[PDB]
Each structure stands twice: as C-alpha cells, then as structure tokens.
C-alpha cells in the first residue's frame, strides 16, 4: 500500500573492545585522564596535548604512556 518497500537491509557497525579499556596496559590510569607524566610538569606542562591512540585488537590506550617505551 506504499510506493516503496524495503526487502533487504545490510547494516554496518564498527566493533571495539570497550572492555572497560578506558584504561592502560602500562600506566593503569584511564585513557581520557592524563598519562601520569601529564598530571604534573614531567614530560610536558601541556596536559591538554595528551592524546589517545588505537591499536589492532579492538582497544585504545594513551599515546604517551605506550610510545614512551620505544626507547626501552
């Protein structure tokens, strides 16, 4: 009784391990919080410049608290 009717629908969604992963493997602290070294003028006074990165296993982490181990 309508001019148009849908018969098929293929919905798409992006999948992430929230997994209470608003946290970190090396750091503990929540990813939207400051990465320890940004809670004080340690790595930087610019606490607002502390960013968040994603990996390849459905989760995120602080940019700084993980990349700091590259020298190690």
């Amino acid at each position: 009784k309508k001019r148009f009717e849908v018969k098929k629908w293929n919905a798409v969604a992006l999948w992430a391990w929230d997994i209470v992963v608003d946290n970190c493997a090396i750091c503990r602290n929540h990813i939207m919080d400051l990465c320890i070294e940004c809670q004080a003028n340690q790595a930087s006074a610019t606490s607002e410049e502390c960013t968040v990165a994603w990996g390849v296993c459905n989760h995120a982490f602080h940019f700084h608290c993980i990349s700091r181990w590259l020298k190690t």
């Binding site: 790595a43 990349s67 590259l70 020298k71």
Partner: protein, 82 residues
C-alpha cells in the same frame, strides 16, 4: 574528492607518527649521531623520508620528553638519552 582529502590526511598523520616514533627508535644503536645522519637513518627507517622542517620540530619535542639530547655544543649533534 572529500574522500581523497581524508585519505590524504591519513597519510600525513601516519607520517607524523612515524617521525615521532622514529628518532626514538634511532640513536640507541648509534649513541652519537648528528642531524645529517638522523635524516639519513630516517630515510631508511621511515616509510617516507622526513623534511628538515618537521624533523627539527620533532627533535625539540623529543628532547623535552627525554628521548634524545643535544651534544658537542652543536644544534645539529644529538645523543641517545637512557
């Protein structure tokens, strides 16, 4: 076109990451190493070589974050920080 712009930005941002991760991943095996050698090591370490403009900027930030330091009383001479 908008999609080409977004993919172009992704390339830029990925290059910007590599030049931040690099340098830190350099020096450790070459404790004393200058700017002209760092760009050369970066040519080989990076997927895409970095211009001296971006390189100097990343170096200064990497010094503030204790990954590298200057030596030999020379703006272009660097040493690994442990």
């Amino acid at each position: 076109v908008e999609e080409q712009v977004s993919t172009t930005e992704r390339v830029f941002q990925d290059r910007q990451y590599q030049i931040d991760a690099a340098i830190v991943r350099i020096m450790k095996m070459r404790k004393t190493l200058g700017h002209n050698l760092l760009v050369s090591e970066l040519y080989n370490q990076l997927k895409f070589p970095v211009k001296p403009g971006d390189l100097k900027k990343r170096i200064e930030s990497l010094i503030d974050r204790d990954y590298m330091e200057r030596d030999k009383d020379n703006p272009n001479q660097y040493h690994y920080v442990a």
